[PDB]
Write a protein that binds this DNA or RNA. Sequence first.
RNA 1: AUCC
Length: 555
Amino acid sequence: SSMSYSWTGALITPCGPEEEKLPINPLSNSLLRYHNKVYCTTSKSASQRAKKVTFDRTQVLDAHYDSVLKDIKLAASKVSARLLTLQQACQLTPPHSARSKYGFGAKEVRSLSGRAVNHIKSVWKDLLEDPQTPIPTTIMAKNEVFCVDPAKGGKKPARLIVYPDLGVRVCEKMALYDITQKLPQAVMGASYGFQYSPAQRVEYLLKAWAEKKDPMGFSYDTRHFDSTVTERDIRTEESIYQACSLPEEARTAIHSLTERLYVGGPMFNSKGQTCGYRRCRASGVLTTSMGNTITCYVKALAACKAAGIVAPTMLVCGDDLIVISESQGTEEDERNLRAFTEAMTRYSAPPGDPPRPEYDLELITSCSSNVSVALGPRGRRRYYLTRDPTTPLARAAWETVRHSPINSWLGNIIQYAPTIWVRMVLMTHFFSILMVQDTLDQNLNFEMYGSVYSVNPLDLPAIIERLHGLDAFSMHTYSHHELTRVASALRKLGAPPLRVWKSRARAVRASLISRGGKAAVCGRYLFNWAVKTKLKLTPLPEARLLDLSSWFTVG
RNA sequence: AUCC
Ligand SMILES: Nc1ncnc2c1ncn2[C@@H]1O[C@H](COP(=O)(O)OP(=O)(O)O)[C@@H](O)[C@H]1O
Ligand SMILES: [Cl-]
Ligand SMILES: [Mn+2]
Ligand SMILES: [Mn+2]
């Protein structure tokens, strides 16, 4: 049937100059030594990505699909969604959102300047009146940081980002923002993965696991998901949106966004040249996350029925999926997974790596993470979310004139606070750096799901207790997998081994303690793992007082 | 210089 993309041969050009690594990395050169291994993707590789994501989709649905989709529409029909006012939508624009071609930017949008508001009014009017003319988009290469991988070819090509003008982006929110906040939760319930903190994700997976008489679990991820989404998938997404009760004006804008933007359209590079035409998900539109997540769910659940998965419990985040189910014996389990993959493949969601059944929860990786186990203060098993620290360490070492890595250190410290790598390596580095700079009490930003939260370093103990529990400060006897993976990642980036971080941490602890106040609390709680004779850590009063519920939720 |  349809090609994901077609190309005119015009280059995908840089969206500004692309920042230079420097000869000295003064904030991370005591974290690790192999700076040569840390790179950022750029437009120079966009052509290679374009080639890998351009292909012909043929899609073949069946009765399991029809049946799932039907259930999902019923579920959607219970949702009432409203238009956002033009002004509400304006003010949800992020502060550095890329400016309009029409002579205004995010500052103006967010402040509701008259020029910007009037442009947007007219964009909205045109959406209500013209349901057909394709809306032009810009295509750009994503700049992201990774550690080189010789196994997988050295350096990954840049992902492709496709987005419409700022004025349209505002209009998307008027039409769909309220739906983005309600629909996924309504159609998926507990299966919607972007509602859970790391501890909650763990709790849910363990509960799912313990509920089966004889569990089997697997993960799945689609190769290049956005390019595999069909025009028909996208119109099906609309029909799911339209099943909610909406005012008529929303219906009209939603249909018009669908036909003019979401299903496809022409693409221009940053120099304004025609670059290509698209017939798949534009990653960059408002509906990217909701769309990916709902369409993944529909396909996956239909594929579960097709393969005969018994008592499936799912967890879906975009195109990342875990399914925990009742094992039918390893022989049938393996057949069932092949049938799952074949069905997903008919549905136009082929796998990156073929999935495989597992019967031990530590061995399942989804959303770049997995559940592991360690022992707590009282010797009980304690489960928590971890990941390979390779990419976090590489991002910990991205330092340019334009970019400081300190916020990424913080982000990882918060999300992965119970992990051996955060506690021994990143915490030790973070605190050492800030003490020496004398910036310990200076607020930093925590970035998550596109939101930004201001955090003071000296409040970490309370934040961590609240988010992960007091046991995050007393885990020991980490697992073989985790010890092996962390040691290996450190060697690979030329970082000191864990025993050296332990010595460093003793010294960081003592300095923190010597400063008194909140600093000393950080030393006692965050680095109790580092001393010979432990302290008895007690609940922090400030922790009871904190509400962090918005950090890890969409809705 | 995309969206959640
Ligand atoms: N930075 C991003 N901006 C917008 N959308 C994204 C981003 N990262 C991932 N996505 C969306 O989620 C999908 C799945 O991502 P992933 O599994 O990480 O890679 P792939 O695109 O190869 O499947 C993407 O195809 C894209 O539509
Ligand atoms: Cl314990
Ligand atoms: Mn994928
Ligand atoms: Mn994925």
